[PDB]
Write a protein that binds this ligand. Structure first.
Ligand code: NA
Ligand code: NA
Length: 327
DNA sequence: CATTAGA
DNA sequence: TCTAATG
């Protein structure tokens, strides 16, 4: 956690590189298992060799470790950090919709800069066009102050269209967080569950609403269960307009909300731990359900959940407010 | 790890 | 169809 930091950190630097700049899934996959293990290791790694004793720790990595252990640097790390080509990939990737594949192709063409990107909006698809359009806006954090306003709004439409609609604003926001990145609305409705062969309009109606009013300014992708877009707070009695925010809404079968809702709310650790727990308590939890455990090794049978509580009860825990879902 | 675009 | 990019 701190005794092995530089190593694990240099390591992930290295891995992340091979995966992005190069197309070395393997090497990249290497650095990470290694970075994983040394991370675990209970002691100040004193030399490559000591490291080396490790599972996943070959001679390549060991070698790197020593150089780093001796000199607070690495050449390959220094070189990479400089490398414009590679610097460029790392950067283009920030554009929502730009991935590494694209990040490289772009380069190979010579689109290294943001401006490059503009001169060739043509070479870009709608996703990436939007990514570029709201570049500043997409990187900025979401004041919970604004979050509250946003939420107030969707809750208003959802209800307005059908009173039957259930919507939860999951995430860190949910967990009380001061700021957030993007809004995440978990959606569901009674007339939609596990079996009852969809009702796509169910999602659709709402999006239409939210646009209708100008909350949703754009569509990144909208499918029959998952919409991906952009929203915006009505820029008041002017002088101050609002930033374009990322927003994501998802239709859920009523019979899987709470697990889902449980889940998206997190935190990443609260989950595992909660998950690890259900396990002892003779269970299994995952993004949609909770099934009692059978001793034959495994077992099925989806337990019935009417709220975040049922799930707690089941595995018999203390109801933990989203506030304290930290870990 | 599953859902959407796109080509 | 596969392959990408997001969460
Ligand atoms: Na070893
Ligand atoms: Na990106």
């Amino acid at each position: 956690e701190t005794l092995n930091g530089g190593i694990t950190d240099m390591l992930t630097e290295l891995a992340n590189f091979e995966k992005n700049v190069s197309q070395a899934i393997h090497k990249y996959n290497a650095y990470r298992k290694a970075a994983s293990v040394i991370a675990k290791y209970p002691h100040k790694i004193k030399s490559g060799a000591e490291a080396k004793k490790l599972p996943g720790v070959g001679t390549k990595i060991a070698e790197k470790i020593d150089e780093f252990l001796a000199t607070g640097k690495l050449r390959k790390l220094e070189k990479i950090r400089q490398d414009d080509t590679s610097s460029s990939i790392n950067f283009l990737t920030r554009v929502s919709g730009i991935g590494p594949s694209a990040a490289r192709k772009f380069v190979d063409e010579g689109i290294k800069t943001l401006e490059d990107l503009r001169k060739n909006e043509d070479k870009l698809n709608h996703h990436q066009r939007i990514g570029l359009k709201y570049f500043g806006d997409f990187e900025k954090r979401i004041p919970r102050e604004e979050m509250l306003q946003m939420q107030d709004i969707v809750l208003n439409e959802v209800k307005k269209v059908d009173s039957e609609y259930i919507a939860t604003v999951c995430g860190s926001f949910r967990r009380g967080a001061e700021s957030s990145g993007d809004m995440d609305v978990l959606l569901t409705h009674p007339s939609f569950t596990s079996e009852s062969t969809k009702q796509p309009k169910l999602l659709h109606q709402v999006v239409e609403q939210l646009q209708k009013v100008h909350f949703i300014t754009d569509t990144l992708s909208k499918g029959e269960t998952k919409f991906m877009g952009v929203c915006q707070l009505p820029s008041k009695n002017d002088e101050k307009e609002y930033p374009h925010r990322r927003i994501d809404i998802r239709l859920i079968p009523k019979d899987q909300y709470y697990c889902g809702v449980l889940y998206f709310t997190g935190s990443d650790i609260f989950n595992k731990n909660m998950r690890a727990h259900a396990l002892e308590k003779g269970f299994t939890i995952n993004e949609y359900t909770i099934r009692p455990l059978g001793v034959t090794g495994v077992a099925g049978e989806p337990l019935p959940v009417d709220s975040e509580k049922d799930i707690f009860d089941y595995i018999q825990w203390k109801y933990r407010e989203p506030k304290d879902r930290s870990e």
